[PDB]
Design a protein around this ligand. Structure first.
Ligand code: DGD
Ligand code: CLA
Ligand code: CLA
Ligand code: CLA
Ligand code: CLA
Ligand code: CLA
Ligand code: BCR
Ligand code: BCR
Ligand code: BCR
Ligand code: BCR
Ligand code: LMT
Ligand code: HTG
Ligand code: HTG
Ligand code: OEX
Ligand code: CL
Ligand code: CL
Ligand code: FE2
Ligand code: MG
Lengths: 334, 81, 28, 342, 36, 37, 36, 451, 62
């Protein structure tokens, strides 16, 4: 056929070792750009004035960091939410001082990861699958949007986006607790239920299927050779697994329907992480965790502290120390 | 399948609700009175709102001695009256 | 202050519709 | 023949609504007392004499702030038995001294033992391999390291976690400010195991649900499964091709897949437990010495690592007077660490 | 910088046009079953 | 405040905004009465 | 045996749960724990 | 009972409303009854707000979101946004509440009493989802209805009292709009503005002339488009690009509403023109700027030369330069220098904030407004304790801007999820594999191995 | 007029509560639908009439 038809046929081909697709034509260049800039910056970028106070923070390995302390540092508070591409800087030296790499990386990453999700829809369609793996992926994806884009928008600066680094991540978490009391927010609590529960049900399902593998091997070989890729029969006895778990708790607390079971495995962590993402995305607009500071009062009016008041003392320590040279006025309003 | 009567049979039966229209409110009222009479405070040693501090004190009555801790609490309580 | 009474009549209206229809073998 | 032991064994293993077993003789009293102890304390019992805190519904706390709080630091690691030398059989004083804390921690520990014995006992009776009990060793390693070993290495039970929502949050923030626990590679492995386990849970459930065979006419597809059926309900071959083309690699062995789902979260929790055993002794990953040497000599050198230490220093100074009342800390305003204005 | 800006604008426009015209090129029919 | 003539209905006005939520719960009462068929 | 329909039991039980939890939220604003 | 179980319909109870896809009569009832619920809430919630309304407190101190919408249209308020007459709020609430009974009546009728399908009863009201011209015709009717709605806003602004204008010279006031902006270079220029800082896309609209003129354009565009879709049928290229099914159309609208929800979130968070701060409280940027203004005023009264005051970092403690040189407030609020508001603009000259105006021309009302906004910043807890997260209980406050921003982000996000859910399902159903893979015709088994 | 107002509005609330229960029960009832249809017609017209009465009387009690 014509060259455009052949090109379209290759792009959407189900026979490519890695599927490309139309989402892929955006995903591949954007993710390569973000990856290459990230790696180069992580190794070699000079210090970045994250808080706009001419106090540059060193993030790269060559400038004194190890793997745990290193980061790509968010762009300057003086930029705020302004779009700061390379061509807006007078020079690369200026671009680097002000944290230009961070914006390039997170914007290419967020676009590429959004296309990764669309690409999961697209291949499922080409293969004749049902379509909702991409909906499961929307939960981690929404969480990345929350910490790299929505929280900066609500606070008015990409300098408050999560840094691209291990210790920078912890910095973001501690400051977030000081300013939003996230631990006391029910959407973060649902998030914890989601990931604790996800890990629990992962171990549970793994242990139950492994416990009921049908004997197909000898004592001196891995039991994994008892399963052959593409065999039609199930490789474990779900009736035995349910017979075990239903007696562990009680019969009606156990799944006998594999489709119901696996739907539950999908839904529990996905919904929980959706609420995690929505916690960050709504604390982005300063609707914060529950505040019970001085909620308990005695007959005279003395404050009777609760554990919430002890949390408050810890939060205060974080608040008064963070960004120790950046505040001139008494209230931290963003 | 384990021999016991199904729950859906039990809680839709008239006899169940003849019994439990009495026992459930009775327990609820018993728990209410446990608090409203003040007995809960005295069983567990929980301060009433007027019993955290004496009128002018502002130091918490923290237990500081392991083996005479019982007498220390008793002394703390006497200082309220 | 009287608010509880209102919520009771309003709150019962829904289940009462289902009950009246179930009693008369209606088109639930 | 059938002696009284075998007659008892018969009754214990009857197929009833709630299975009992020999393990049930340990599990049910201990689990019930731990749970009942927690509900009793959070509803009625104060922490005024151990912590200077209200901690019960009776005092005005809500579900997020109630707790059964640890005993006073002056108790040391006393078992704090009701009949012991501290409470001397006085139930009211026992409650005021923190006796419900060791009651719950100790009955909880033996209940967890009873539960894992139950997993073994039932697996043996129905004829399956005991991997569910094996995987439960991770919850046990966490409970034992956090609620027993950690306070046993510290000055007293006071510094164990108190049993409550906000009390546990305080425990997290204490570990950040005092131990720099986020920097600890054993915690990091724990995080990877928990988040990796949640990832595996979600991706496996979603993959199965989206590679199902059409085994019925309904648009709601749950009814098209029969527990006794021999056939796989989803296509491993299609699932494998999808992930190979999306992500580059894919499972091909279902037995390996499900073992991996056990391995990842179980191993992560085990690693986090090892780090907490270190923190029992204050053997922290608190600092990078090379960073501190450079920063001390060069007042322009700043990383996210040094920024977080300043947060920790604030946490310690601002929370310690009320969080550690036995120390009688008095920190004058002028010594408190603070940045500009705040 | 101006040359860099023009270059990136052209690159982005190129890939965006591929995306849009690609999905306009009979995408519902690109499946293994009923094409319509 | 509402105009003074309507003040007798203040307790009713306080409850009205929640009524839409009751419609969602009613769907479950109805489905329970037909056995979630 | 089965004289009281299960949907009525569930509805009444569920309404009782709403009432008691509603009472507990009321108490967050009044008396002890209200900050007042 | 037609189609009201899983066996007949193929859908379980928890997907029960999918049983309605091809039952146009009952589906009409569901839609009309749902519109009744929306209108019911608007009326009931307004009456609740009014009953709880103390007119001498700011609206934003009282948990109000609907009365602020009515007041922005110029009803019930006067200079500075002060409430002069609550009767319009009462009218809006009652009329919505009465109307919801009408909608609920028709909804319940069509849902359980009227014909389950409309096609046998009426060719006009009956429809096949796959009848493309019938779909564009109903779309056209609704576009015309929407265009009329946009022109009702215009009529209110131009002929029936005007709108509340926070920017009115001499102070905010209700103002009749007599010269709406009609220049398409201005109206559509908003659409081509970057959404990033200092630009803000359409969220940057900052005067009522542009607002009204925009709605004139939107009104005519929707009426023209509606007539167009009544008179035409989808072109071949459109026919080949879309899925034509009830669930596909729903998925398209879900994507549209998600986008609109994200836009509304940013509108209420940043814009103080169509969300006047008199009614909604200050924006986040606004309150932060107001803090800097407050301590500039205080310290300057004490004798500080605020232009030459060097802060600890070397930047000006009160005043500094933006990255393009404009004079702006210092401290962390450097990020908010794109903020514009009527209490601050009198201090701005060509190069930004003007030191001579700061030294000589700050009026007491500006000090008041800055103090008010700094102390009603949109920060507060989920249980409505106002202030930073470490603040003690005392002030019962969460800004309406936070309530409206958070709620609509949550709803927009879930509507994006719903879009992906129904778009992916509509595709799979149109292609015939939404119920799973055919064991005897598994597509991957006919493909060459990857390696 | 205040007595006429308070009577008309209380009647409107009562009739509304009667219609809210009675209309769906009648619509879904097999028996006696002809008697129901006329009642629903009557209730609806009376409902509309009361709204107008309350609306008019509003301006003579405020
Ligand atoms: C199909 C579409 C596919 C799209 C493909 C990609 C196309 C580009 C998309 C770019 C995304 C936006 C990035 C920046 C968003 C932002 O900073 O938005 C902010 C802007 C508003 O900007 C602000 O606008 C303000 C306007 O106010 C000004 O004017 C006002 C007048 O009253 C006041 O006076 C005020 O004080 C004054 O400053 C100022 O300019 C500020 O400086 C400026 O920052 O919002 C806006 O433009 C409008 C809102 C944009 C949407 C919000 C993004 C939500 C994304 C969620 C995704 C979740 C995904 C989950 C995955 C699973
Ligand atoms: C399997 C069930 C079980 C287990 C393992 C435990 C375990 C425990 N309980 Mg709990 N308890 C239980 C059920 C259980 N309990 C029940 C059913 C009740 C309600 C009655 C309680 C009520 C309870 C209270 C009120 C308290 C405990 C406490 C304890 C702890 C200390 C116990 C101790 O020192 O006993 C020692 C006794 C034995 C180990 C028995 C050994 C028997 C030997 C082998 C036989 C020899 C007997 C000997 C001949 C007798 C001679 C006496 C003579 C010389 C004078 C320990 C963790 C204490 C606590 O938690 O402190 C914080 C505490 O205060 N329990
Ligand atoms: C906005 C919410 C909403 C609306 C408008 C609808 C509407 C509808 N549903 Mg769905 N549904 C919903 C939410 C909703 N549903 C939810 C949350 C669930 C999960 C529980 C379902 C699960 C579900 C299933 C499983 C089914 C439906 C069906 C239907 C249709 C017929 C219902 C019927 O026959 O009832 C019979 C009920 C009665 C006769 C009892 C009375 C019902 C009336 C309407 C209550 C009116 C109360 C009101 C206060 C009266 C005001 C009167 C006043 C104005 C005068 C109808 C169009 C059915 C269908 O698709 O038909 C083909 C169907 O099988 N729904
Ligand atoms: C856009 C919707 C919206 C917004 C922004 C507001 C905002 C506000 N309301 Mg209003 N209201 C609404 C809708 C809304 N409301 C609805 C639907 C009702 C009927 C129930 C009401 C009835 C109402 C009353 C009676 C009152 C308010 C009040 C208030 C004020 C205080 C709110 C508060 O304390 O929340 C508390 C916070 C919560 C209750 C948390 C809600 C969390 C939900 C469950 C999360 C939902 C997530 C998502 C939808 C679920 C997805 C499930 C997933 C699996 C997909 C605040 C201005 C108060 C006020 O001050 O009036 C003057 C007041 O008394 N509102
Ligand atoms: C979008 C909403 C909508 C739609 C598409 C329909 C459509 C239909 N209705 Mg239903 N109905 C509705 C809402 C709706 N109705 C409401 C709100 C009520 C309660 C009042 C009813 C009560 C009702 C009854 C009792 C009956 C119908 C019937 C019908 C069918 C015959 C219609 C006809 O011949 O009218 C011909 C056209 C006219 C009579 C012109 C009417 C002009 C209107 C009143 C002016 C509208 C102005 C403006 C657009 C209103 C804006 C409203 C907005 C602000 C909410 C048709 C399928 C009949 C039926 O199903 O046959 C068995 C029937 O008996 N409807
Ligand atoms: C609810 C509103 C609505 C909806 C759902 C439709 C739906 C439709 N329209 Mg109609 N239209 C409308 C309103 C609407 N129209 C109005 C108000 C007017 C007057 C201006 C028109 C004038 C109109 C014409 C002249 C035509 C249509 C056509 C169509 C059909 C093809 C749609 C399409 O492919 O767009 C998808 C758009 C593209 C594929 C263009 C390229 C995609 C770019 C990249 C979009 C970028 C958007 C991006 C998100 C940026 C957003 C913000 C931006 C302002 C910066 C479809 C049935 C076509 C048809 O077949 O007629 C019968 C057609 O020729 N419409
Ligand atoms: C405006 C107005 C009005 C109106 C009214 C109305 C409109 C009403 C409605 C109402 C309604 C509409 C109601 C409803 C209700 C409902 C309910 C109350 C429900 C509940 C539920 C539950 C409780 C559930 C349970 C369950 C089940 C059933 C199953 C599963 C399980 C569970 C548990 C979940 C009137 C007349 C007053 C007059 C004045 C004015
Ligand atoms: C300690 C002790 C003891 C014991 C005791 C006991 C054993 C007790 C028990 C107790 C109990 C056993 C109690 C219980 C309680 C319960 C409760 C208190 C509950 C509540 C609940 C609720 C409130 C609910 C909620 C919810 C949820 C959860 C989800 C969904 C929905 C809702 C929200 C509803 C003895 C004597 C041995 C000795 C001494 C010491
Ligand atoms: C279909 C269906 C459904 C749904 C339904 C619906 C959604 C309905 C709606 C309905 C509606 C939507 C209704 C409404 C109503 C309303 C009314 C009934 C009102 C009345 C009003 C009044 C009576 C007023 C009065 C007053 C005045 C005039 C002045 C001021 C004061 C007051 C407020 C008192 C469900 C889910 C169940 C499921 C089954 C099926
Ligand atoms: C009112 C107003 C105004 C105005 C506004 C306007 C004038 C607007 C317009 C707007 C517009 C005018 C919009 C548009 C939109 C569009 C869209 C949104 C599109 C979409 C598309 C799509 C979605 C497509 C897709 C696809 C592709 C891409 C490929 C192939 C396949 C398909 C077809 C699927 C202003 C601001 C001045 C001021 C304020 C007020
Ligand atoms: C952002 C700018 C883009 C705005 C474009 C607005 C759309 C207006 C009409 C554009 C139509 C595009 O034209 C589109 O591309 C080519 C041109 O023959 C066609 O070509 C396609 O046809 C068939 C459809 O089965 C495909 O299998 C084939 O592989 C492909 O080449 C599409 O069928 C046609 O629909
Ligand atoms: C506490 C349980 C462990 C100790 C069990 C010792 C059993 S002892 C054993 O028991 C038989 C009956 O069971 C008797 O018939 C027999 O004579 C006796 O030796
Ligand atoms: C659809 C019902 C809308 C009811 C609108 C009532 C008119 S609104 C009314 O109009 C006057 C000019 O005539 C203005 O001066 C006045 O301020 C305004 O409130
Ligand atoms: O930048 Mn990063 O952190 Ca958000 O709060 Mn304000 O700003 Mn800064 O202080 Mn706190
Ligand atoms: Cl910091
Ligand atoms: Cl500042
Ligand atoms: Fe599995
Ligand atoms: Mg209380």
């Amino acid at each position: 056929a014509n060259l455009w038809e052949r090109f379209c046929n290759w792009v959407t081909s189900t026979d490519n070792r890695l599927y490309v697709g139309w989402f892929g034509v955006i995903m591949i260049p954007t993710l390569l750009a973000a990856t290459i800039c990230f790696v180069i910056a992580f190794i070699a970028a000079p210090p970045v004035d994250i808080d706009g106070i001419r106090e540059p923070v060193s993030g790269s390995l060559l400038y004194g960091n190890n793997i745990i302390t290193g980061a790509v540092v968010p762009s300057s508070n003086a930029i705020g939410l302004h779009f700061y591409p390379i061509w807006e800087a007078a020079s690369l030296d200026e671009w680097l001082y002000n944290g230009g790499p961070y914006q390039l990386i997170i914007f290419h990453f967020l676009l590429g990861a959004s296309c990764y999700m669309g690409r999961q829809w697209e291949l499922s369609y080409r293969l004749g699958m049902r379509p909702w793996i991409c909906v499961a992926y929307s939960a981690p994806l929404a969480s990345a949007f929350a910490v790299f884009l929505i929280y900066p928008i609500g606070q008015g600066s990409f300098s408050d986006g999560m840094p691209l680094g291990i210790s920078g991540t912890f910095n973001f978490m501690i400051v977030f607790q000081a300013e939003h009391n996230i631990l006391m927010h029910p959407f973060h609590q649902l998030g914890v239920a989601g990931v604790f529960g996800g890990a629990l049900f992962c171990a549970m399902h793994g242990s139950l299927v492994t416990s009921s593998l049908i004997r197909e091997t000898t004592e001196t070989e891995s039991a994994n050779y008892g399963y052959k890729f593409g065999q039609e029969e199930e490789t474990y006895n779900i009736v035995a697994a349910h017979g075990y778990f239903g007696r562990l708790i009680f019969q009606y607390a156990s799944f006998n329907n594999s489709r119901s079971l696996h739907f539950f495995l999908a839904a529990w962590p996905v919904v929980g992480v959706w609420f995690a993402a929505l916690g960050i995305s709504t604390m982005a607009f300063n609707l914060n965790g529950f505040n019970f500071n001085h909620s308990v009062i005695d007959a005279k009016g003395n404050v009777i502290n609760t554990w919430a008041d002890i949390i408050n003392r810890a939060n205060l320590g974080m608040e008064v120390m963070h960004e120790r040279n950046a505040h001139n006025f008494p209230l931290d309003l963003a | 399948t384990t021999g016991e009567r199904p729950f859906s049979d039990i809680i839709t039966s008239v006899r169940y609700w003849v019994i439990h229209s009495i026992t459930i409110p009775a327990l609820f009222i018993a728990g209410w009175l446990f608090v409203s009479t003040g007995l809960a405070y005295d069983v567990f040693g929980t301060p009433r709102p007027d019993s955290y501090y004496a009128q002018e004190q502002r130091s918490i009555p923290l237990v500081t001695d392991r083996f005479e801790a019982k007498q220390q609490v008793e002394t703390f309580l006497e200082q309220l009256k | 202050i009287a608010q509880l009474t209102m919520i009771a009549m309003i709150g019962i209206a829904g289940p009462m519709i289902i009950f009246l229809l179930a009693v008369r073998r209606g088109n639930l | 023949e059938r002696g009284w032991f075998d007659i008892l064994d018969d009754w214990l293993k009857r197929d009833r609504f709630v299975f009992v077993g020999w393990s049930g003789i340990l599990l049910f009293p201990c689990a019930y007392l731990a749970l009942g102890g927690w509900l009793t304390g959070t509803t009625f019992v104060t922490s005024w004499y151990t912590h200077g805190l209200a901690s019960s519904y009776l005092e005005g706390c809500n579900f997020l702030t109630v707790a059964v709080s640890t005993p006073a630091n002056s108790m040391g690691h006393s078992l704090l038995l009701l009949w012991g030398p501290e409470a001397q059989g006085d139930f009211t004083r026992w409650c005021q001294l923190g006796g419900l804390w060791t009651f719950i921690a100790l009955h909880g520990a033996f209940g967890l033992i009873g539960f894992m014995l139950r997993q073994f006992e039932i697996a043996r009776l129905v004829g399956v391999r005991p991997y569910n009990a094996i995987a439960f060793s991770a919850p046990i390693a966490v409970f034992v390291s956090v609620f027993l070993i950690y306070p046993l290495g510290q000055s007293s039970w006071f510094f164990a976690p108190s049993f409550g929502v906000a009390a546990i949050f305080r425990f997290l923030l204490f570990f950040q400010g005092f131990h720099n626990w986020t920097l600890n590679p054993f915690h990091m492995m724990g995080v990877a195991g928990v988040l990796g386990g949640a990832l595996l849970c979600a991706i496996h459930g979603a993959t199965v649900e989206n590679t199902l065979f059409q085994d019925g006419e309904g648009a709601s597809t749950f009814r098209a499964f029969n527990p006794t059926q021999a056939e796989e309900t989803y296509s491993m071959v299609t699932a494998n091709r999808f992930w190979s083309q999306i992500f580059g690699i894919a499972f091909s062995n279902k037995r390996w897949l499900h073992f991996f789902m056990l391995f990842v979260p179980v191993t992560g929790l085990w690693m986090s437990a090892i780090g907490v055993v270190g923190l029992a002794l204050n053997l922290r990953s608190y600092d990078f010495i090379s960073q501190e040497i450079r920063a001390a000599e060069d007042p322009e050198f700043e990383t996210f690592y040094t920024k977080n230490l300043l947060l920790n220093e604030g946490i310690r100074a601002w929370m310690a007077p009320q969080d550690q009342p036995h120390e009688n800390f008095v920190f004058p305003e002028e010594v408190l660490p603070r940045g500009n204005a705040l | 910088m101006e040359t860099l800006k023009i270059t990136v604008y052209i690159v982005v426009t190129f890939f965006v046009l591929l995306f849009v015209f690609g999905f306009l090129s009979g995408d519902p029919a690109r499946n293994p079953k009923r094409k319509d | 405040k509402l105009p003074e003539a309507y003040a007798i209905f203040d307790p009713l006005v306080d409850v009205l905004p929640v009524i839409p939520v009751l419609f969602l719960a009613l769907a479950f009462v109805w489905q329970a009465a037909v056995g979630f068929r | 045996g089965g004289r009281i329909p299960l949907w009525i039991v569930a509805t009444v039980a569920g309404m009782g749960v709403i009432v008691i939890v509603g009472l507990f939220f009321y108490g967050a604003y009044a008396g002890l724990g209200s900050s007042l | 009972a037609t189609n009201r179980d899983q066996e007949s319909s193929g859908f379980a109870w928890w997907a029960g409303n999918a049983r309605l896809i091809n039952l146009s009569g009952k589906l009409l009832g569901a839609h009309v009854a749902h519109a009744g619920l929306i209108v019911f809430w608007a009326g009931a919630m307004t009456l609740f707000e009014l009953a709880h309304f103390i007119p001498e407190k700011p609206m934003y101190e009282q948990g109000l979101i609907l009365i602020p919408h009515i007041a922005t249209l110029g009803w019930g308020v006067g200079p500075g946004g002060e409430v002069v007459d609550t009767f319009p709020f009462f009218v809006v609430g009652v009329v919505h509440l009465i109307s919801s009974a009408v909608l609920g009546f028709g909804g319940v009728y069509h849902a359980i009493r009227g014909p389950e399908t409309l096609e046998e009863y009426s060719s006009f009201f009956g429809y096949d989802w796959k009848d493309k011209n019938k779909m564009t015709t109903i779309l056209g009717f609704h576009l015309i209805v929407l265009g009329i709605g946009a022109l009702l806003l215009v009529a209110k602004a131009m002929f029936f009292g005007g709108l509340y204008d926070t920017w009115a010279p001499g102070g905010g006031d209700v103002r009749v709009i007599t010269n709406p902006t009609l220049d398409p270079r201005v109206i559509f220029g908003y659409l081509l503005k970057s959404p990033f800082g200092g630009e803000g896309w359409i969220v940057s609209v900052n005067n009522l002339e542009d607002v009204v003129g925009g709605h004139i354009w939107i009104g005519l565009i929707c009426i023209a488009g509606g007539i167009w879709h009544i008179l035409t049928t989808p072109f071949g290229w459109a026919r080949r690009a879309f899925i034509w099914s009830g669930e596909a159309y729903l998925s398209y609208s879900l994507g549209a509403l998600s986008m609109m929800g994200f836009i509304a979130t940013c509108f209420v968070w940043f814009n103080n023109t169509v969300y006047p701060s008199e009614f909604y409280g200050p924006t986040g940027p606004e309150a932060s700027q107001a803090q800097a203004m407050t301590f500039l005023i205080r310290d300057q009264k004490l004798g500080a030369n605020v232009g030459s005051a060097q802060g600890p970092t070397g930047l000006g403690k009160y005043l500094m330069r933006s990255p393009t040189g404009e004079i702006i407030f210092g401290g962390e609020t450097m990020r908010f220098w794109d903020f514009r508001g009527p209490w601050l603009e009198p201090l701005r000259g060509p190069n930004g904030l003007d030191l001579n105006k700061i030294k000589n021309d700050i009026q007491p009302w500006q000090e008041r407004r800055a103090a008010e906004y700094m102390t009603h910043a949109p920060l507060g807890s989920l249980n409505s304790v106002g202030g930073v997260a470490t603040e003690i209980n005392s002030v019962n406050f969460v800004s309406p801007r936070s309530w409206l921003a958070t709620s609509h982000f949550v709803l927009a996000f879930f509507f994006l999820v719903g879009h992906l859910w129904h778009a992916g399902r509509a595709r799979a159903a149109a292609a015939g594999f939404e119920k799973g893979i055919d064991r005897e015709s598994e597509p991957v088994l006919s493909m060459p191995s990857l390696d | 007029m205040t007595i006429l107002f308070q009577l008309a509005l209380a009647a409107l609330v009562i009739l509304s509560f009667v219609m809210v229960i009675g209309v769906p029960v009648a619509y879904a009832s097999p028996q006696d639908w002809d008697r129901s249809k006329q009642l629903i017609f009557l209730g609806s017209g009376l409902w509309i009439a009361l709204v107008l009465v309350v609306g008019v009387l509003n301006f003579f009690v405020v």
